[PDB]
Amino acid sequence: MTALLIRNVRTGADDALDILIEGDRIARTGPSLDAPPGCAIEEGAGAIALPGLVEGHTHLDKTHWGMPWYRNAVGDRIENERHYRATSGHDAGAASLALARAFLAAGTTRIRTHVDVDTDAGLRHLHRVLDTRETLRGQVEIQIVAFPQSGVLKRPGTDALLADALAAGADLLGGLDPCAIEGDPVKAVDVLFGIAERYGRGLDLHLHERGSMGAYSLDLILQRTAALGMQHKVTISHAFCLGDLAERERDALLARMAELGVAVVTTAPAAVPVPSVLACRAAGVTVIGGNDGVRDTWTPYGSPDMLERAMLIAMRNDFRRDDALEVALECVTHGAARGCGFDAYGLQPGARADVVLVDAMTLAEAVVARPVRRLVVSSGKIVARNGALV
């Protein structure tokens, strides 16, 4: 069995310590640790040690990472994507693998990805991402959400396909906009929860609906979550309507989400209202950070650097204080892991030995400066140095 002693690192505002790793777990933390015989030594040189970063919401199947630049002349964005996939030979396999490897090189060791599951492609995108997940076993842990991007109710056979996706290895059921997309919100929520209940799985639902319509759909989702006892098994992604509502109605919904263990994903889009990270926090709602798309036919933006996403969340929420920047960093570390149900997380003994070293004086500096990951350790193995896989 292999041991790794990372000497002389800082977890933040605290004295420096060493981190002893054995197998895939953190074995010991503290100052001036003894070295087990034959243990490898890594000199941390006073760097900040971070737990493995977490991508709580992306779309690995859609990315053009590693491909030639996608020239965007979109006007109409759902029909553009479908035409691209039906006139190009896009391979969710090489793309998802390249992007997930870039995530790893930048210190992200846990990823929740949505994958399109629909009657245009069947399970083809799912199978490609499952291949990528198997290639990266022991290197990146990947949760897969089976996402009916173009809807369920109006597309015959989509319900059975989503069930097939869960049976084939998708971890979570996805879905979207029970009013705006599905047209029959009660039927849509009942169909989706029925499928997830059959496989005993959780759900992560895209909710773009604005204002009172979004609040209505959210209420329906939370009602069903409570009725089925699906505690800590439902995630709401985007949830823009929480930025539209009066504070009274907003906090009542957030209170219900906190009670049910429902987390919210924010990707901090700069041009639409977002849930206030501090309002969620004050209500007891866990906030998960995510990129959303990364260089696909929807968006040219996105990055495998989750420190950059933390920075963008902080900017979007008008954070300036150091402790507010640390709240944003929590959205791509402990908060994202808690919200997504990523277990054995952190830098304490017994946690999975995911360790990311960065040259920064403070956690707040690491958020805004995004220093290169000097070292990435994943499941106790050194996988990257100076931002590149070794």
Binding site for Zn ion (CB under 5 A): 292
Binding-site partner at residue 46 among Cl ion, Zn ion, none, CB < 5 to 8 Å by type: none
CB of 270 to Zn ion, least distance (A): 14
User: Rule CB under 5 A: which of 69-108 touch Cl ion?
Assistant: 106
| Helical (H) or strand (E) element with 259 | helix 247-260
Query: What whole-number distance in Å separates Cα of residue 289 and Cα of residue 121?
Result: 29
DSSP 266-301: E---TTS----HHHHHHHT--EEE--B--SSSS-S-
Among 319, 330, 335, 336, binds Cl ion (CB under 5 A): 319
Binding-site partner at residue 292 among Zn ion, Cl ion, none, CB < 5 to 8 Å by type: Zn ion
Indicate the residue among 149 and 217 with the shorter CB distance to Cl ion.
Answer: 149
* Site for Cl ion contains 377 (CB under 5 A): no
Indicate the residue among 40 and 361 with the shorter CB distance to Cl ion.
Answer: 361
C-alpha distance from residue 42 to each of 7, 12, 26, 215, 313 (Å): 6, 19, 14, 51, 32
* CB closest to Cl ion, residue no: 122
Binding mask 2-41 for Cl ion (x = CB under 5 A): ----------xx----------------------------
Indicate the residue among 26 and 207 with the shorter CB distance to Cl ion.
Answer: 26
Stretch that binds Cl ion, among 135-143, 262-270, 293-301, 358-366 (CB under 5 A): 358-366
Q: Mapped to the 3 state alphabet, what secondary structure does 340-357 carry?
A: HCCCCCCCCCCCECCEEE
- Which residue shows structure tokens 């060493």? 18
* Site for Cl ion contains 341 (CB under 5 A): no
| Helical (H) or strand (E) element with 235 | strand 234-238
Burial class (CB within 10 angstroms; exposed 0-12, middle 13-18, buried 19+) of 219: middle
DSSP code, position 96: H
Query: What whole-number distance in Å separates Cα of residue 264 and Cα of residue 275?
Result: 8
Binding-site partner at residue 106 among Cl ion, Zn ion, none, CB < 5 to 8 Å by type: Cl ion
* Site for Cl ion contains 194 (CB under 5 A): no
The residue type found at 4 is L
* Site for Cl ion contains 169 (CB under 5 A): no
* Site for Cl ion contains 303 (CB under 5 A): no
Give the β-pairing of 3-9 and 17-22: antiparallel
Angle between helices 92-105 and 124-135 (to 10 degrees): 40
Q: Are 362 and 165 in contact (CB under 8 A)?
A: no
Of 264, 261, 262, whose CA–CA distance to 277 is shortest?
Answer: 264
Binding-site partner at residue 179 among Cl ion, Zn ion, none, CB < 5 to 8 Å by type: none
Indicate the residue among 274 and 351 with the shorter CB distance to Zn ion.
Answer: 274
| Helical (H) or strand (E) element with 197 | helix 185-199
The residue type found at 290 is G
Dihedral, CA of residue 78, residue 79, residue 80 and residue 85, to nearest 10: 100
Indicate the residue among 257 and 356 with the shorter CB distance to Cl ion.
Answer: 356
The annotation status of 59 as a binding-site residue, yes or no, is: yes
The annotation status of 61 as a binding-site residue, yes or no, is: no
- Strand spans (E) along 52-140: 53-58, 108-116
CB of 181 to Cl ion, least distance (A): 22
Count residues binding Cl ion (CB under 5 A). 17
C-alpha distance from residue 166 to each of 14, 71, 127 (Å): 44, 34, 12
Binding-site partner at residue 13 among Zn ion, Cl ion, none, CB < 5 to 8 Å by type: Cl ion
CB of 168 to Cl ion, least distance (A): 9
Stretch that binds Cl ion, among 92-100, 181-189, 276-284, 364-372 (CB under 5 A): 364-372
CB of 42 to Zn ion, least distance (A): 36
The annotation status of 206 as a binding-site residue, yes or no, is: yes
CB of 226 to Cl ion, least distance (A): 31
Residues of this chain that bind Cl ion (CB under 5 A):
12-13, 106, 122-123, 319-321, 324, 346-347, 362-363, 371-373, 387
Numbered residues of the known binding site:
57, 59, 206, 292
Numbered residues of the known binding site for Zn(2+):
57, 59, 206, 292
